[PDB]
Amino acid sequence: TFDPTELPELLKLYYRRLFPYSQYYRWLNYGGVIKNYFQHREFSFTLKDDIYIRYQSFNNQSDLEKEMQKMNPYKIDIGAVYSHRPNQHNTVKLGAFQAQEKELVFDIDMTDYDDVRRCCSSADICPKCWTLMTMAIRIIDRALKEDFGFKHRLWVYSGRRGVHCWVCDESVRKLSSAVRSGIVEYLSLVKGGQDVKKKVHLSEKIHPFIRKSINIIKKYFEEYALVNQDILENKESWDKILALVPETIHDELQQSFQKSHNSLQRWEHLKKVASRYQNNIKNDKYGPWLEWEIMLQYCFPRLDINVSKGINHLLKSPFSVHPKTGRISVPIDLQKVDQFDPFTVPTISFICRELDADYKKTSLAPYVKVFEHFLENLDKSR
Ligand SMILES: Nc1ncnc2c1ncn2[C@@H]1O[C@H](COP(=O)(O)OP(=O)(O)OP(=O)(O)O)[C@@H](O)[C@H]1O
Ligand SMILES: [Mn+2]
Ligand SMILES: [Mn+2]
Ligand SMILES: [Zn+2]
């Protein structure tokens, strides 16, 4: 949390000497190969007192610099590319102003993991629970890269409680809401709200996406689940895991749990016991489906779904400030995803302090270098 009276004086300087305007324009101009592509983009500025304006568009980079430095917006959201100039949508015939293109986006909030987190809750995050986002980035990014063939993926720290992903392949920017829904369904395993206890069910045959995602989780599960969260510490915690396991084997576990001493041994026990449960009496097929359902329910990414369906849904811009923490929405170095510390992310107050002691003078520089690598990969593919 932050004290929000300093923000305006900090924002003035940030938009004057620190915001990477050139790289930003390179990005949303996309080479200038399509006409009106930057000029038909919706921007949404949030000002002081949570007053926000929509359908703000601009002619060129300089126009953007000017109006941003004139409003010093608390928060900047990117929208869709529309049929006409967003800032002229009243002069257009009703029914002819329609969203046409936007990147495929993903919003991941840690709040959706409160049911499986024990250290933090609500908007809080700590190094112990942050591994979820790491695995989230690992799982989704892999599927985005290999199962769908998307080459241009930008991962961004949302500034507080999770991360964002912008997918910018030219054909992906054209996808309708229908295809985006289908993509989210392909990527989702944790179903059900607070109403249901067991939120993951696996079919008898395993789809490669599930096997590969499980294998990703099997890299982190020891460190995250059995040590940092201690999901099997005592009865208070392990009864939450038994709630999603068949009851005919509960007794044997509770016994074997009390006689055990820590979460490692209890997990090894649960594995053996689940690999001996018979789901179907016809066949003598046994497997780790319950083990896998547990690991998925506790570690698999939960996506904010309605963020990805809408073509015209707004998402916080990269390098925009989060007005409730002061943190800058910085890109995530994928080659160092495990090393990403959300607590080393520069705040606006902090880099303005660094500057007075251009953006490459500050701790924002390596993040801009990440953004430029993403942009140069966009340039090569053209
Ligand atoms: N009233 C609104 N109108 C339009 N878009 C909205 C509105 N409220 C939120 N959004 C969009 O929803 C997106 C994601 O919601 P969310 O609360 O998760 O924000 P965030 O930027 O991801 O920050 P956080 O790290 O807290 O998740 C935002 O980037 C914003 O663009
Ligand atoms: Mn978010
Ligand atoms: Mn959200
Ligand atoms: Zn935590």
Phi, psi at 311, each rounded to 5°: -75, -30
Q: How far is CA 109 from the centre of its chain?
A: 7
Q: Is 75 in the pocket of ligand 1 (CB under 6 A)?
A: no
- Catalogue the E-assigned strands of 322-362: none
For a substitution probing ligand 1, which of 309, 314, 319, 330 has the most ligand atoms within 8 Å of its CB? 314
Q: Give whole-number Cα distances, 56 to 104, 109, 179, 202, in Å.
A: 20, 27, 27, 45
What is the Å distance from ligand 4's center to 226 Cα? 14
DSSP 8-state symbol, 18: T
**Resolution of this PDB entry, in A?**
2.8
How many domains is the chain partitioned into structurally?
1
- Non-local (6+) Cβ contacts of 327 within 8 A are 157, 159, 160, 321, 342, 345, 346, 347, 348
Could you identify the residue written with the tokens 């993926």?
153
Q: Give whole-number Cα distances, 191 to 36, 157, 183, 206, 329, in Å.
A: 40, 25, 15, 17, 29
Q: At what angle do helices 250-259 and 263-274 cross, to 10 degrees?
A: 150
Beta bridge partners of 109: 162
Annotated catalytic sites, by residue?
42, 107, 109
**Annotation: binding site for Zn(2+):** 119-120, 126, 129
Q: Is 110 in the pocket of ligand 1 (CB under 6 A)?
A: no
Percent helix, strand, coil in the chain (nearest 5)? 45, 10, 40
- Non-local (6+) Cβ contacts of 178 within 8 A are none
For a substitution probing ligand 1, which of 111, 302, 308, 316 has the most ligand atoms within 8 Å of its CB? 316
The token duo for 66 is: 């000017």
- Catalogue the E-assigned strands of the chain: 41-46, 52-56, 75-82, 99-101, 104-109, 153-157, 162-167, 315-316
Q: Which atom belonging to ligand 1 lies closest to the Cα atom of 109? A: 27
Determination technique for this PDB entry?
A: X-ray
Q: Is 42 in the pocket of ligand 1 (CB under 6 A)?
A: no
Q: Is 327 in the pocket of ligand 1 (CB under 6 A)?
A: no
DSSP 84-106: S-GGGTTTSPTTT--EEE--EEE
Q: Which atom belonging to ligand 1 lies closest to the Cα atom of 304? A: 18
Could you identify the residue written with the tokens 């004139």?
70
Domain harbouring 76, CATH code: 3.90.920.10
- Catalogue the E-assigned strands of 29-117: 41-46, 52-56, 75-82, 99-101, 104-109
State whether residue 331 is helix, strand or coil. strand
CA–CA distance, 35 with 42 (Å, rounded to integer) = 15
> Domain span at residue 365?
1-382
- Non-local (6+) Cβ contacts of 23 within 8 A are 368, 371, 372, 375
Residue type for position 380? K
What is the Å distance from ligand 1's center to 287 Cα? 41
Exposure string (b/e) for 258-287, b if CB count within 10 Å is 16 or more? eebeebeebbebbeebbeeeeeeeeeeeee
CA–CA distance, 335 with 345 (Å, rounded to integer) = 17
The token duo for 375 is: 């942009």
**Annotation: binding site for a ribonucleoside 5'-triphosphate:** 107-109, 158-164, 313-316, 322
Q: Is 154 in the pocket of ligand 1 (CB under 6 A)?
A: no
- Backbone region of residue 198 per phi and psi (left: phi > 0; alpha: psi in -120 to 50; beta: other values): beta
| Cα atoms found within 13 Å of the Cα of residue 284, Cβ hemisphere only | 0
What is the Å distance from ligand 3's center to 304 Cα? 5
When computed from its CA atoms, the radius of gyration of the chain, rounded to whole angstroms, is 23
CA–CA distance, 307 with 272 (Å, rounded to integer) = 40
**Annotation: binding site for Mn(2+):** 107, 109, 304
> Whose CA is closest to atom 20 on ligand 1?
158
Q: Is 141 in the pocket of ligand 1 (CB under 6 A)?
A: no
CA–CA distance, 361 with 28 (Å, rounded to integer) = 25
